[PDB]
Design a protein around this ligand. Structure first.
Ligand SMILES: N[C@@H](CCC(=O)N[C@@H](CS)C(=O)NCC(=O)O)C(=O)O
Ligand SMILES: N[C@H](CCC(=O)N[C@@H](CS)C(=O)NCC(=O)O)C(=O)O
Ligand SMILES: N[C@H](CCC(=O)N[C@@H](CS)C(=O)NCC(=O)O)C(=O)O
Ligand SMILES: [Cl-]
Ligand SMILES: [Cl-]
Ligand SMILES: [Cl-]
Ligand SMILES: [Cl-]
Ligand SMILES: [Cl-]
Ligand SMILES: [Cl-]
Ligand SMILES: [Cl-]
Ligand SMILES: [Cl-]
Ligand SMILES: [Cl-]
Ligand SMILES: [Mg+2]
Ligand SMILES: [Mg+2]
Lengths: 228, 224
């Protein structure tokens, strides 16, 4: 008799499923994690997300919610007593505008990180370097939005907000972006690097993110799984 | 910035048309400004510097971009007006209904625009292929609507989040049919029916062009 029967269909190295893991951890919500083999998807995943057949999928008392950013908003809507990722406009202030800004930047993460990152290990030579330059600029753009704040959330909450959660799993890929793209996050976007180190000390993030070296090793298998 | 709301837009954009419809549904007046996409205004470049795309909604000079974002902003910022998404804490299944609505609106964004463009862009068996895929997409939206009057709640009798997201694309159905070799009536009749019902609603009459005008525009796109 707690809050919820939560189950998460996921894949260990997924940045998208990691979002939902961190958000539940942040919220004190316990869940059953089920590892899926994406080459051998389970009947339950295929039934629970028939449209996309992707993880993560969150099942709350047997009813599925797909798409990581949708699950994140759900975790606020469905559990109003837990610390919120987006400010409730249920208190007015500049809440409405702050929510819109947060959705814009989470959307921007969804549009840029995964796809643009993947080019870094799918391409080689100059095309790879060019993809690296675009990655650096994406990180500079994130940096610019963070400005002088401790977190993307705005703010003074001292904890992870919606955008922070959306972006933080990719901090585990920064190393891989560095080696493949030919730049250093520290040089290109020092304040984003500092943000990644701050986030990296937070228990939810420590728990749910793999190390940069483990991700680099996975990128290694991906780099083979495409050309040969 | 004469009235509170200024919408930077492009006349035939289905994404801007969502915002126009949403405001009309909410009783919110706004100033409409046409952007020349080959000559973007300084105001647009400054307000959406990240993507440089319309629509942009400026509420008392503050920009909100991304059409689905704007729709949610219009509920959040104007809580007294008719809602596109049911309020989470104000059925008691609101949380789940909202997630379902966001899921489907995302589906429209991920499929309609992109699958549709291919239909006029390409010209042969690839065009045909695009055709095939659009038909399954419209079929999938049909199955989510099921026997309901609107994608939104129901009992209420008005457009919700997903209706408004998708409705402008109903003006493009004729063009998809022509370009991709299929019939909406054959592949998704209940969806065709939904489109007709929405087409009697004041906001939709006002802000959507006719299918023929969309098709002519498609023809202008091709010639170029
Ligand atoms: N829009 C998504 C994408 C999630 C996604 O890309 N999942 C990958 C794993 S990282 C997947 O399940 N696709 C399955 C496949 O490769 O067949 C979300 O935000 O959750
Ligand atoms: N519509 C897509 C957009 C692709 C995109 O997001 N490009 C990334 C690299 S993967 C980028 O850095 N774009 C320019 C920017 O975000 O400033 C396309 O043109 O193919
Ligand atoms: N993410 C979308 C995209 C809006 C969009 O695609 N805008 C197009 C016009 S329909 C645009 O502004 N393109 C600018 C250009 O062509 O440079 C939204 O929902 O608002
Ligand atoms: Cl693995
Ligand atoms: Cl199963
Ligand atoms: Cl709660
Ligand atoms: Cl290459
Ligand atoms: Cl902060
Ligand atoms: Cl560097
Ligand atoms: Cl431009
Ligand atoms: Cl299906
Ligand atoms: Cl209904
Ligand atoms: Mg750029
Ligand atoms: Mg700099």
């Amino acid at each position: 008799a707690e809050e919820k029967e939560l189950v998460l269909l996921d894949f260990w190295v997924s940045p998208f499923g990691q979002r939902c893991r961190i958000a539940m951890a942040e919220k004190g919500l316990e869940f059953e994690y089920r590892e899926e083999d994406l080459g051998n998807k389970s009947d339950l995943l295929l039934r629970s997300n028939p449209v996309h057949r992707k993880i993560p999928v969150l099942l709350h008392a047997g009813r599925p919610v797909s798409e990581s950013l949708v699950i994140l908003q759900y975790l606020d809507d469905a559990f109003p007593g837990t610390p919120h990722l987006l400010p409730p406009a249920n208190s007015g202030a500049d809440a409405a505008y702050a929510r819109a800004t947060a959705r814009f930047w989470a959307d921007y993460v969804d549009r840029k990180l995964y796809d643009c990152g993947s080019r870094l290990w799918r391409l080689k030579g100059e095309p790879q370097a060019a993809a690296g330059r675009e990655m650096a600029e994406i990180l500079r753009t994130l940096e610019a939005e963070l400005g002088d704040r401790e977190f993307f959330g705005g703010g003074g909450g001292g904890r992870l907000g919606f955008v922070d959660v959306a972006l933080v799993p990719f901090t585990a890929w920064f190393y891989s972006y560095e080696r493949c793209g030919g730049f250093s996050v520290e040089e290109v976007a020092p304040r984003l690097a500092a943000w990644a180190r701050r986030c990296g000390r937070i228990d939810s993030v420590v728990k749910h993110l793999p190390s940069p070296e483990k991700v680099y090793d996975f990128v290694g298998v991906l780099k083979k799984k495409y050309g040969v």
